[PDB]
Amino acid sequence: HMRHRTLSSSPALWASIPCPRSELRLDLVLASGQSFRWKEQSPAHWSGVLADQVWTLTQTEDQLYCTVYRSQVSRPTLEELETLHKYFQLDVSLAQLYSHWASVDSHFQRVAQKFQGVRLLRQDPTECLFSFICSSNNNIARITGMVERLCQAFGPRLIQLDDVTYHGFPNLHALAGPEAETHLRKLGLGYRARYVRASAKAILEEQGGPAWLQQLRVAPYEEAHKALCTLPGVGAKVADCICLMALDKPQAVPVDVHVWQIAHRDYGWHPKTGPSPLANKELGNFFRNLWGPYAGWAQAVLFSADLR
Numbered sequence: 505h506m507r508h509r510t511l512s513s514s515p516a517l518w519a520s521i522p523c524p525r526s527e528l529r530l531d532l533v534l535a536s537g538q539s540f541r542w543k544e545q546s547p548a549h550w551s552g553v554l555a556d557q558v559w560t561l562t563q564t565e566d567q568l569y570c571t572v573y574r575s576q577v578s579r580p581t582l583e584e585l586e587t588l589h590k591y592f593q594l595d596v597s598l599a600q601l602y603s604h605w606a607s608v609d610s611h612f613q614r615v616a617q618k619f620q621g622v623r624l625l626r627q628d629p630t631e632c633l634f635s636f637i638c639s640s641n642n643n644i645a646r647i648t649g650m651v652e653r654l655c656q657a658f659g660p661r662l663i664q665l666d667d668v669t670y671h672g673f674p675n676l677h678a679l680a681g682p683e684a685e686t687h688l689r690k691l692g693l694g695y696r697a698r699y700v701r702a703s704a705k706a707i708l709e710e711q712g713g714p715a716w717l718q719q720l721r722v723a724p725y726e727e728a729h730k731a732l733c734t735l736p737g738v739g740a741k742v743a744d745c746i747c748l749m750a751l752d753k754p755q756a757v758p759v760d761v762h763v764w765q766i767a768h769r770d771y772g773w774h775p776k777t778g779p780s781p782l783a784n785k786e787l788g789n790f791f792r793n794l795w796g797p798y799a800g801w802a803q804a805v806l807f808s809a810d811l812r
């Protein structure tokens with residue numbers, strides 16, 4: 505009944521945002537392990553759910569083009585383009601950050617030449633939290649599958665485009681219920697299903713629901729990180745993910761065995777005393793010390809560069 509818009513097909517439905525490709529490369533951001541809800545349904549055209557609406561995004565060298573599927577079919581409003589502005593955190597100059605990091609790190613300088621426009625998305629805490637609980641012992645394709653199925657089974661239907669049905673992220677009450685783990689195991693999550701249901705239940709009962717996640721957004725990083733590590737299936741790595749990508753702590757540097765490999769190979773880093781909680785914490789401090797208060801954003805450039 506309706507298709508994904510392209511820029512040639514429906515140009516009166518697309519608004520634009522002035523935005524160079526050195527501030528943003530959609531293809532290095534949207535499927536690079538931050539959000540798992542964006543898919544290149546047409547060449548250079550990216551579709552996904554933001555906040556109970558669907559968007560398609562594409563860009564020139566100078567412009568970022570946006571169309572929104574909500575209702576009388578319009579182009580994006582001013583309020584809706586503001587939410588994309590915030591989502592991409594576009595008030596922060598990535599050009600100036602790239603330079604700032606480059607001046608202390610020769611290796612970064614080399615990689616950055618090739619991989620411009622990698623930035624950090626500003627995600628909803630709830631979507632971010634349950635996405636990263638699903639990320640243990642997993643890959644980007646399977647996580648994308650688990651998150652899609654989870655939204656289909658538990659969150660409200662928004663719209664269909666071609667043969668793709670889009671659902672909003674579920675609320676906590678919907679993932680907390682007595683049959684949720686069992687349903688989630690049927691959807692392929694394995695053990696991760698226990699953690700999803702258990703963490704939803706814990707945010708409601710032990711922390712007072714989603715206002716908690718907003719409190720953590722305003723709390724200091726270290727306070728947020730500790731509070732997150734109390735949740736089932738959430739340890740240091742996942743907590744740093746959420747901190748970096750959804751709670752406005754740009755200094756958070758997620759460290760797993762993969763980042764360890766890269767630090768060692770490309771920086772010559774060794775713990776000053778193989779991986780452990782102590783050593784991984786030391787490596788996050790190392791990078792914070794080197795790159796400064798946006799160390800997690802610098803990690804993202806290298807992270808995407810490593811996925812290639």
Ligand SMILES: O=C(Nc1noc2c1CCCC2)[C@@H]1Cc2ccccc21
Nearest residue numbers: 537538639642643644758803804807
């Ligand atoms: O870990 C992931 N993403 C990230 N972890 O730290 C960072 C990111 C992306 C942004 C900057 C810092 C996801 C989960 C998984 C599994 C296989 C491959 C990628 C990924």
Ligand code: NI
Nearest residue numbers: 768772773774
């Ligand atoms: Ni060595």
